[PDB]
């Protein structure tokens, strides 16, 4: 659901009416096609109308990508790794992640047996 | 249609004075437009697109 | 409960009434569907009405993701790790996390016995 960076189109309310003139309907259909089919490409570009209202000084049309301010408060990777290591510790089976070290052995007749082998003996 | 025509009709007129009678119209357009954009231009119809 | 980045929709109060006109009801239903079904996708995009009030200069509609200012004052990972190590120290069973070092032995007849084996002897 991370939605940062998606395109957004702003149009005057009268463009979205059902009885609007054919020109506005064609404009809305073209906007829909653009939204559906725009991708990063060697021909990417836009020609967009631009009009700033004299009494508000804000563009009536707009084209921009949604932005976000804050950042996630928790790092999930570290927590997941910690809990995985905790799970692996319960069975004393850390060999799965740390490999077979030379200081441990799987033989019960050898004086380097690991805890996993000792419990399998039980 | 008639409302759009009436906006133009009102915007044109200005103050006048003949002996004894004096009419001031320079303020009508401000109010008329303020009402118009609030009650008509801002009313959305149809649906957005996702 | 970390909620940074979720979509938010702002509409004039008259759109949420129960007696509103059918057009406003349809608009609200479509907004609900969008909120429920929007996901990051190759077709992600929005066409939204845009109108700036002449006397307030603020958009009456809006679409944005909630933002947060501060950051958590404490790092829970370090605290949890510290307390886990403290627990492991109580039983003198650090071998579970540090593996079987070559300087320690589990044999009671060998002159490298570890504290765990010494206590099991007791």
TrEMBL record, chains A, C:
Q: What is this protein called?
A: Portal protein
Supply the source organism for this entry.
Answer: Escherichia phage JohannRWettstein
Taxonomic lineage of the native organism: Viruses, Duplodnaviria, Heunggongvirae, Uroviricota, Caudoviricetes
Automatic annotation (TrEMBL), chain B:
The organism sits in which domain of life?
A: Viruses
Name listed for the protein in its UniProt record: Uncharacterized protein
Give the organism the record lists: Escherichia phage JohannRWettstein
Q: Which residues of the full protein are shown?
A: 51 to 100 of 149
């Amino acid at each position: 659901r991370d939605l940062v960076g998606m395109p957004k189109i702003g149009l005057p309310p009268d463009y979205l009416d059902e009885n609007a003139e054919p020109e506005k309907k064609a404009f809305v259909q073209y906007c829909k096609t653009v939204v559906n089919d725009m991708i990063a490409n060697d021909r990417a570009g836009l020609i967009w109308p631009r009009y700033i209202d004299p009494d508000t000084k804000e563009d009536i049309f707009e084209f921009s990508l949604v932005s976000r301010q804050g950042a996630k408060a928790y790092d999930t990777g570290s927590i997941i790794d910690r809990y995985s290591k905790q799970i692996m510790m319960a069975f004393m089976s850390d060999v799965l992640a740390m490999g077979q070290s030379k200081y441990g052995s799987f033989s019960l007749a050898d004086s380097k047996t690991s805890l996993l082998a000792m419990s399998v003996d039980i | 249609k008639a409302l759009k025509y009436l906006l133009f009709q009102v915007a044109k007129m200005g103050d006048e004075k003949v002996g004894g009678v004096y009419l001031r119209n320079s303020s009508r357009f401000k109010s008329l437009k303020a009402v118009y954009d609030d009650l008509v231009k801002s009313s959305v119809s149809g649906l957005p697109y996702a």
